[PDB]
Design a protein around this nucleic acid. Structure first.
Ligand code: MG
Ligand code: MG
Ligand code: MG
Ligand code: MG
Ligand code: MG
Ligand code: MG
Ligand code: MG
Ligand code: MG
Ligand code: MG
Ligand code: MG
Ligand code: MG
Ligand code: MG
Ligand code: MG
Ligand code: MG
Ligand code: MG
Ligand code: MG
Ligand code: MG
Ligand code: MG
Ligand code: MG
Lengths: 224, 87, 59, 138, 110, 44, 107, 101
RNA sequence: UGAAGUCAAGUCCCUAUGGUCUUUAUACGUUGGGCUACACACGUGUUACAAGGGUAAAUACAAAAAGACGCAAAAAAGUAAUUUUGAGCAAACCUUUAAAAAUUACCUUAGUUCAGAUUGUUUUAUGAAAUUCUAAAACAUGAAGAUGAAAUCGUUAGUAAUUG
RNA sequence: AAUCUUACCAACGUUUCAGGCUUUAUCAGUAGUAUGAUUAAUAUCAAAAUUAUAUGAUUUAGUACGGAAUUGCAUGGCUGUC
């Protein structure tokens, strides 16, 4: 037999002590609370081959945590749910920048390496649409995909200008043009009037990459 | 993170004026849709409504939905245009 | 708030035999108790810490 | 100088419910009436007088906006005129609260108003209201 | 209705159904193709076992109270015998003669 | 005449006042209160 | 996420204000209440009441007492001052510029 | 119009006078808001009025009467930094002396 | 405590002032935003890479300084930050202030009961207001780092270093 | 450097003295506030309650308009360093 909780799987050969390093959310204080409920020591085993321990094991141990859930997955959703609504914190988890107002001109290195939740949660989303293409190409897309969605909302005056230029030659020439996704992954752009004073980048509507990759006149630029 | 729950959420003079104008049925319009004081929380009555939020020298647009409730206006808007080192 | 999720020894079985300062109960009997404070530093122990009658103690 | 505060372990934690101490409320009884009190002072024919000691301060600095610095009026009261019983004394030590009190006298302070007169009469209204509520016990 | 919305206007807590759908979703964003999320919730699959959401935090309502207290008066008098009944009437009537309390009271009326 | 201080304590609890309460626009523009009744009634 | 765990301790967190049963009061409880009428003390639970903000002291006028000195600007505090010489220099220097301004306008 | 000092002194003046008179109002409203034992509504309706007031006369910040400079101030003297270096030359400060510990 | 005066050193943007320019705007008030951005790189400084350390429990000794648009004891609650409460003092009188160490016991050289960043979510405090853009506590996350190339800096006794 | 600060960017608005003195004209059921409505905000409007306090509130003209605008290689003043 077995018993599952918090995404960890229990059996009658386990040792409830050495689950400490493994489970995600239950280090020290909770086990003390738990062994108070079992009325036993750390050194004793809370599990045995006899059924009395097993049913007693499950009845107590279910009260702490709701069944068929985890803490790890709950954590990532509370992160993605922020970026899922197009929030400020949504970007800073994605790019690798700090969240808590921490500075950037000198030191944000521990964010760029450790925080990797929202990133991996998007690679799986890209596979659900654009298949099992290798990762570094997929990275080019949803980076390029969010950017236009930002410029569409926040800087709407600029998106329209990128949209207008595309549609003029569309009716007149019927010639080919291209999209520089590899330029948009790094954040480079084109197609408006600046204060300083064929390919297009920004004028699309969201989800456009689905429209073109998976249906001659238009040709994609992923790599270089 | 946020404030303690008992420290009730902030809604300024303005939005309290707007919530009443909703209550009368007065529709939202050019100036009434305008928003300032971003720290004011995003109330619940004003679902199904557009509000042109202010930053700098221009504005941003959004609609309210039940998921957007509870948050702050300024957490959906970007002020500082991102920085990219050129080639 | 003093116990904080522990077991007193007046509920533990074996200490019940000896916890009770009942020497009068023993015909031809006597009781002797002591207080070790090696593990503690400057620990004032006395019959005020334990609510304990006067007279039956010796500093 | 001041030595540092330390929380000593006065009482051990786990002591049996039967071996603890519990003390009833000695102030639970039938409170006295009024003529019982007046019958005590028959030597004086309905007239009581209290000996007290009035401290008071002044400053050269109590002016335009610091003129409130002269509002305290500290007082002491002597008790040997008060034929205080064992039960009347403890009642009086509770009303004052965690305040100074001796067998000989106790303090009384008021800083409720700006002018010290108004803070002085209030002490008299307290001394009366404490003597009666104290001698309402036997 | 205006004051309550500094209470009811409150962050949304997620149900376990919503989070299994956060994974199986395809769209990265919400405001773009909003209706598809409403559709992607509507898919029913009872093959999975019964589900228990976490408990939300100890929220508190509009009419609720955090900690109730026993009501008392300002000046608690033991008047069972009734002696203090006389000490009070002269006291208050003395105060009004010197410093009355008959004020315009622009705010409250009684 | 004027009342005394003691006589007013007799009329302490006699609350004669009619419809006294925290309000908004009432004495200035009671029309909007009527609209506020219509709208939330229409939603029922 | 919000990790909640059960508290195996029970009962209201005790307070002086909560031990009181006004229908059945002890002697030690009527006595403290008899002190509160005298000195105006307060009895409240472990939780926050507003008395800490009613008892506070907040003296903003003491700053105005500095602004009302007018040591920095005599004319605002003592308008009878009239700096005659400083006005003269202010007028001479102006008029001599206007000589320069017109004579440079031609030149 | 007025030069910078004589103007800015008035701004920081009117901010205090507002506070001096709305003192009792803003102490009672804020009293209710932190009274946990009461229901939430009355705790909020006070919070509603507590914000329905001129916040502009509440953004107070210190200033020196003489220099017009705001950042560094000596509360013990009520005057600034660039000035005390001057008066110390003239010895105009009363009872002060140079710390030699 | 620090001469003469040099480095046309620095500042007209603390305030003053000569010349120059502007005066329906290069002036003024308010609202919101910004000064907190982020490829690479420099200077400064705190904390660590452990066992002359980490931790738990019981429990000692200070100076100097400050206090009413304040300090806030005692008792009580909380896991803890902290809160209720406000005796007493405008003062060598009342109040706010220690740790390291020492004692007893565990951990037994391991990227570890070391390290402690970063992130999620409640709670705690101030304020009108914390999202842009604050600090702290807890449950949980638990990355780099294993005493640092060439080069280079401080110190002369109650000094270095360590402790608060 | 959360607002103010803060000079900078964007936008709405103001166009010449705070107090005191002199002066032109009107209003006085008007004026004011811990009041009320109004705007994002300053502003602006006003009679449900409240305040009435000696010789008012508002307005024209005048009484050194203003300036973190520039030149520290025209200077004071303040200061570093040898
Ligand atoms: Mg923050
Ligand atoms: Mg021994
Ligand atoms: Mg307190
Ligand atoms: Mg400040
Ligand atoms: Mg220069
Ligand atoms: Mg700076
Ligand atoms: Mg160490
Ligand atoms: Mg201890
Ligand atoms: Mg002490
Ligand atoms: Mg204490
Ligand atoms: Mg006192
Ligand atoms: Mg030690
Ligand atoms: Mg590691
Ligand atoms: Mg550790
Ligand atoms: Mg090692
Ligand atoms: Mg700012
Ligand atoms: Mg500003
Ligand atoms: Mg300027
Ligand atoms: Mg130079």
């Amino acid at each position: 037999e077995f018993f599952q909780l918090n995404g960890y799987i229990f059996t009658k050969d386990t040792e409830f002590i050495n689950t400490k390093k493994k489970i995600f959310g239950w280090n020290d204080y909770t086990y003390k609370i738990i062994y108070n409920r079992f009325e036993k020591f750390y050194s004793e085993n809370l599990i045995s081959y006899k059924d009395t321990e097993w049913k007693k094991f499950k009845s107590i141990l279910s009260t702490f945590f709701p069944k068929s859930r985890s803490l790890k997955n709950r954590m990532d959703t509370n992160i993605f749910f922020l970026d899922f609504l197009n929030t400020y914190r949504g970007l800073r988890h994605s790019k690798g920048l700090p969240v808590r107002g921490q500075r950037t001109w000198t030191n944000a290195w521990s964010v760029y390496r450790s925080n990797l939740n929202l990133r991996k949660f998007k690679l799986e989303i890209a596979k659900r649409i654009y298949g099992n293409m290798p990762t570094p190409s997929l990275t080019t897309i949803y980076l390029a995909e969010q950017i236009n969605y930002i410029w569409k909302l926040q800087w709407k005056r600029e998106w329209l200008q990128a949209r207008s230029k595309r549609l003029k030659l569309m009716q007149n020439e019927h010639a080919m043009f291209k999209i520089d996704i590899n330029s948009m992954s790094k954040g480079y752009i084109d197609g408006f009037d600046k204060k300083k004073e064929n390919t297009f980048t920004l004028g699309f509507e969201p989800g456009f990459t689905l429209f073109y990759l998976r249906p001659n006149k238009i040709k994609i630029v992923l790599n270089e | 993170m946020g404030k303690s729950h008992w420290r009730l959420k902030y809604i300024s003079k303005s939005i309290i004026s707007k919530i009443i104008k909703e209550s009368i049925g007065i529709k939202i319009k050019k100036k009434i849709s305008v928003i300032m004081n971003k720290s004011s929380t995003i109330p619940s009555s004003l679902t199904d409504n557009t509000f042109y939020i202010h930053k700098g020298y221009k504005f941003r647009e959004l609609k309210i939905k039940d998921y957007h409730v509870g948050f702050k206006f300024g957490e959906f808007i970007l002020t500082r245009k991102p920085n990219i080192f050129p080639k | 708030t003093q116990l904080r999720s522990t077991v007193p020894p007046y509920h533990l079985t074996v200490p019940r035999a000896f916890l009770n300062f009942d020497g009068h109960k023993f015909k031809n009997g006597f009781v002797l108790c002591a207080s070790s404070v090696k593990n503690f530093h400057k620990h004032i122990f006395g019959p005020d810490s334990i609510d304990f009658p006067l007279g039956y103690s010796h500093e | 100088s001041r030595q540092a505060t330390v929380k000593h372990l006065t009482k051990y934690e786990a002591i049996p419910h039967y071996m603890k101490q519990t003390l009833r409320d000695p102030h639970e009884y039938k409170l006295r009436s009024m003529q019982q009190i007046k019958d005590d002072l028959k030597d004086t024919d309905g007239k009581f007088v209290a000996r007290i000691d009035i401290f008071y301060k002044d400053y050269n600095d109590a002016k335009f906006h610091e003129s409130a610095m002269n509002k305290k009026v500290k007082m002491n009261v002597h008790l040997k005129n008060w034929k205080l019983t064992h039960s009347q004394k403890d009642r009086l030590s509770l009303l004052l609260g965690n305040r100074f009190m001796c067998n000989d006298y106790f303090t009384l302070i008021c800083d409720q108003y700006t002018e010290p007169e108004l803070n002085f009469e209030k002490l008299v209204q307290q001394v009366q209201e404490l003597y009666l509520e104290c001698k309402r016990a036997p | 209705h205006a004051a309550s919305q500094m209470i009811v206007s409150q962050k949304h807590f997620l149900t376990a159904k919503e989070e299994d759908r956060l994974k199986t979703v395809n769209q990265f964003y919400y405001e773009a193709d909003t209706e598809a999320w409403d559709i992607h919730l509507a898919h029913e699959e009872h093959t999975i076992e019964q589900i228990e959401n976490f408990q939300p935090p100890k929220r508190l309502g509009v009419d609720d109270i955090e900690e109730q207290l026993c009501d008392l008066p300002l000046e608690y008098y033991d008047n069972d015998d009734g002696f203090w009944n006389d000490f009070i009437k002269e006291k208050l009537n003395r105060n009004n003669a010197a410093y009355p309390a008959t004020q315009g009271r622009a705010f409250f009326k009684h | 005449r004027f009342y005394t201080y003691d006589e007013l304590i007799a009329n302490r609890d006699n609350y004669t006042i009619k419809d006294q309460l925290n309000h908004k626009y009432r004495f200035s523009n009671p029309e909007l209160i009527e609209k506020f009744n219509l709208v939330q009634s229409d939603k029922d | 996420p919000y990790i909640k765990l059960p508290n195996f301790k029970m009962g209201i967190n005790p307070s002086l204000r909560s031990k009181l049963n006004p229908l059945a009061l002890t002697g030690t409880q009527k006595i403290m209440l008899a002190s509160s009428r005298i000195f105006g003390t307060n009895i409240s639970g472990n939780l926050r009441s507003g008395n800490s903000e009613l008892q506070k002291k907040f003296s903003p006028e003491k700053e105005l007492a500095e602004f009302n000195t007018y040591a920095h600007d005599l004319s605002s505090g003592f308008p009878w001052v009239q700096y005659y010489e400083q006005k003269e220099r202010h007028k001479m220097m102006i008029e001599l510029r206007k000589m320069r301004i017109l004579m440079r306008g031609i030149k | 119009m007025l030069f910078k000092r004589r103007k800015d002194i008035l701004k920081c003046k009117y901010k205090k006078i507002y506070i001096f008179k709305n003192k009792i109002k803003n102490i009672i409203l804020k009293s209710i808001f932190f009274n946990r034992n009461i229901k939430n509504i009355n705790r909020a309706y006070a919070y509603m009025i507590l914000n329905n007031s001129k916040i502009l006369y509440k953004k107070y910040h210190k200033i020196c009467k003489f220099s017009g400079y705001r950042k560094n101030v000596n509360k013990f003297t009520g005057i600034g930094r660039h000035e005390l270096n001057r008066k110390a030359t003239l010895g105009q400060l009363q009872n002060i002396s140079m710390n030699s510990w």
